[PDB]
C-alpha cells in the first residue's frame, strides 16, 4: 500500500554525506502514468550553514535514517477520494538530500566536507526506473514542491532529453511545478545574508550556485552571460525557454518569498507601506504568470499544495486543482480551464484558501 | 448532483401505455466518456400478463410518476470512492418502460392497447444526445442489467451503424451486458407456461418475441432460419456475430435463470438431483465463456451488479469488477487481466460474493 524505498545502485551518485540517495516505489501495472515528484526543504550555500543543517535536519543531507515505506499523499495518493483523476499512477517519491535545489551534477570535491549532486539524483533515479516499469509508460510527469518545484524547472528538460537519448521517445515527458516560483526581489526591509532566513532571494543563489557547482537548464543559460547563470533559478527567466510542458501551481503570497522578504504575515495589523510591499508582490506574482498557459494561483497566504491531503480543497474561479491538472493532461493529448490566476489584492480574497 | 429526467420530444416514441420515454441524464463537460445504462425489469408477454404488469409495477410501464432526478450508483455513480476510473463520465440512465427486453422497433397497432418500443426508445435518446455533448465523445458504452443486459447484446451494433450513419464514425461504440447472459436450458422440474416467474427460458422469448413484434441483431437473424429469430436473445447465440466488443459479466448461479429454472436456494439442504441440476447449470454457463475475451463472471447467486453501490467488493481471481473493466478499455485502446471466470462448482465457493 505504501511506496517502499529503494537505494540508488550507482555509488557515485550520494546524499550530501556521501551515503547512497534514493527514491520511493509504489509500482502500478494497470497505469502507464509516472508522478516523479521532488521533495523541498530550502538549501543550504555555505559550509557553515551545510554544518548546521546537517545538525539539525540530517535527514535533508543523508538516507542514514529514512524509513523503508512512505505513504503516499495528495497527488502521490493511490486513494481515489484523495486523488480522483490520478490515484492509479505509478508513483515515485524522490527524498531531497542534496541541499542544493536539485541543481548539482558534479562529483564531490576534496575540497568539501559534502557532496552537491541533485541533478545527477534524479538522472540516476530515471534510468533505475526504467527497469521497472518506466520503459512502458506514456506520461512521465516531474513534479516536486518548493525547492523540489524549483528543481523540476531545472531539471524536466534534461530528462525528457534523456528519455529520449537512451531509447524511449513516446514517453511524454512534463513538470508540475508547485510553489517553485519566486521573485528576485528586494527585501521589505534589508538583512544581511547570513543564512537562508536573512539571505534576500538574488544573493541566496548566486552564493548557493557557486557553492554546489550548480547546473542551469541549457535553454536558459544561453539568454544570460557567463557568471549570471542564476538568473535561470528564478522561474519567470527559466520558463519561457522550456520545451517540455509545465503546469505551475503557485500561491500568490507563498510564505517562503515572504520569509527571504522579511514579511511575516500572522493576522496582526500591518502599516502602511507593507500594505503596499505586498499587495505589489502579488501584482508581480500574477505579472509573471500572464503568458503561462497552465496555471493554478490562488490568492492565499501558504506554502505547498500538491502533496497535502486537502489538496482538492482549493479552488480559483470555480475549479479544483485535481481538475485544472486533468484539462491540461486532456489539452496536451470546452468547459475544462488550465489558466486559472486569481486577481484580488491580498490573501484569503479567495475565500477557498487553506485555513 | 444528481442525474436529471428529459422526455423525449419525438411523440412517436412511447413507453407502453403511450406516455413518453426519457432519459436522465447528468453531463461531465471534462470527459469525452458516456455511460448509457438500460434498466432491467423483466418483461410481459401477453395482454393478460401486461395487465397485471400494469396495475402492480406501473413504472415498468408509464413514466406517469417517474421522479424529476435519480441518484447515480454503482458505475453510474459521479464519486470517486464508488467508481474509481469511470466516476466523471457523462452518465445517462434509460428508465425501461417498454416490457420487451428492449427489442420492440414499431407503432402500436390499433389491435394493441400498449406500444413496445425499446429499440426505438435507445436510437430517440442516441439522438437526442448528440445536441447534448454526445456528439464530442471518444466512447459510448451502452451498458445494462438484467432485461437491460440482454437490451445491450440486442441494439449495441444497432447504436454503432447508427452512429455511423449520422455522421460520427470517431465515437467507439462498445457494450457492458450485466446479468443478461441467460441459457435456453430445461426447468429442473416442469410449471406450465402461464406468467413470467413460471415460463421457461424458450417459451417465454417464443412468445414474447412476437408479441412485441420484437427485432433481434441482423448479424444473428441470419444464422437462423425464418421464425426461430427467438435464439438471438441468448447471449452465447448472439455474442459470436456481434462486431461491438462487449464486457459480459455474469454471476454463475443467476437468480433469475434459477427463478425460470424453477429452483429456489434459499440456504436449505438439497438433494442430489438438484446439487447435480445446479452444478451442471454453472458448468454451462462457463463453457459458454470459454470465448468469450472480456468476462467476470464470479461463483454466486446473485442478481445483477454494475448499479450496485456494492459492486466493487466482488473479485475473481484476485482482480474487481472496476479493474477489470478499466483493463478491457485500455486492451481497445500485462498484469491488467479481463477474462475473469470461477471455476468452482457452488454459489459462494467465492469467498468475495455478496452477503
Ligand atoms: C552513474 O552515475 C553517473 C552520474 O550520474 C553517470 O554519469 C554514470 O553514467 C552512471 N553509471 C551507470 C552505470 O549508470
Ligand atoms: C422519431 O422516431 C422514429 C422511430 O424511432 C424515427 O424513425 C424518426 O426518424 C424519429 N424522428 C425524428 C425527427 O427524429
Ligand atoms: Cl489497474
Ligand atoms: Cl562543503
Ligand atoms: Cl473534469
Ligand atoms: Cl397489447
Ligand atoms: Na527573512
Ligand atoms: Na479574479
Ligand atoms: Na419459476
Ligand atoms: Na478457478
Redesign the interface.
Known amino acids: 500500500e505504501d511506496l517502499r524505498l529503494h537505494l540508488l545502485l550507482n555509488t557515485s551518485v550520494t546524499c550530501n554525506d556521501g551515503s547512497p540517495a534514493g527514491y520511493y516505489l509504489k509500482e502500478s501495472?494497470?497505469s502507464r502514468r509516472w508522478l516523479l515528484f521532488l521533495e523541498g526543504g530550502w538549501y543550504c550555500f555555505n559550509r557553515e550553514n551545510c554544518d548546521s543543517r546537517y545538525d539539525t535536519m540530517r535527514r535533508l543531507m543523508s538516507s542514514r535514517d529514512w524509513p523503508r515505506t512512505r505513504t503516499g499523499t495528495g497527488i502521490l495518493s493511490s486513494?481515489?477520494?484523495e486523488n480522483?483523476?490520478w490515484?492509479?499512477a505509478n508513483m515515485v517519491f524522490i527524498p531531497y538530500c542534496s541541499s542544493d535545489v536539485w541543481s548539482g551534477a558534479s562529483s564531490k570535491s576534496e575540497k568539501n566536507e559534502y557532496a552537491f549532486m541533485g541533478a545527477l539524483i534524479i538522472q540516476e533515479v530515471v534510468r533505475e526506473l526504467l527497469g521497472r516499469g518506466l520503459s512502458?509508460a506514456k506520461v512521465l510527469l516531474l513534479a516536486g514542491s518548493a525547492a523540489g518545484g524549483t528543481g523540476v524547472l531545472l531539471n524536466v528538460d534534461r530528462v525528457a532529453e534523456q528519455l529520449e537519448k537512451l531509447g524511449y521517445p513516446a514517453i511524454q515527458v512534463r513538470g508540475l511545478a508547485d510553489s517553485g516560483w519566486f521573485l528576485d526581489n528586494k527585501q521589505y526591509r534589508h538583512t544581511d545574508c547570513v543564512d537562508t532566513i536573512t539571505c534576500a532571494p538574488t544573493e541566496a543563489i548566486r552564493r548557493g550556485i557557486r557553492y554546489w557547482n550548480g547546473v542551469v537548464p541549457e535553454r536558459c543559460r544561453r539568454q544570460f552571460q557567463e557568471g549570471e547563470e542564476w538568473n535561470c533559478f528564478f522561474g519567470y527567466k527559466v520558463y519561457p525557454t522550456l520545451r517540455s510542458p509545465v503546469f505551475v501551481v503557485q500561491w500568490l503570497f507563498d510564505e517562503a518569498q515572504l520569509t527571504v522578504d522579511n514579511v511575516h504575515l500572522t493576522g496582526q495589523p500591518v502599516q502602511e507601506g507593507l500594505r503596499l510591499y505586498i499587495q505589489n508582490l502579488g501584482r508581480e506574482l500574477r505579472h509573471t504568470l500572464k503568458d503561462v498557459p497552465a496555471s493554478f494561483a490562488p490568492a492565499c497566504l501558504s506554502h505547498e499544495i500538491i502533496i497535502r491531503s486537502h489538496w482538492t480543497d482549493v479552488q480559483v474561479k470555480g475549479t479544483s486543482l485535481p481538475?485544472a491538472l486533468?484539462?491540461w493532461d486532456?489539452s496536451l493529448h470546452?468547459?475544462?480551464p488550465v489558466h486559472l490566476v486569481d486577481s484580488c489584492p491580498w490573501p484569503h480574497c479567495n475565500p477557498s484558501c487553506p485555513t
Chains 1, 2 share one sequence.
Open positions: 501495472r494497470g486513494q481515489p477520494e480522483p483523476y490515484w492509479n512502458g481538475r486533468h484539462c486532456r470546452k468547459g475544462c
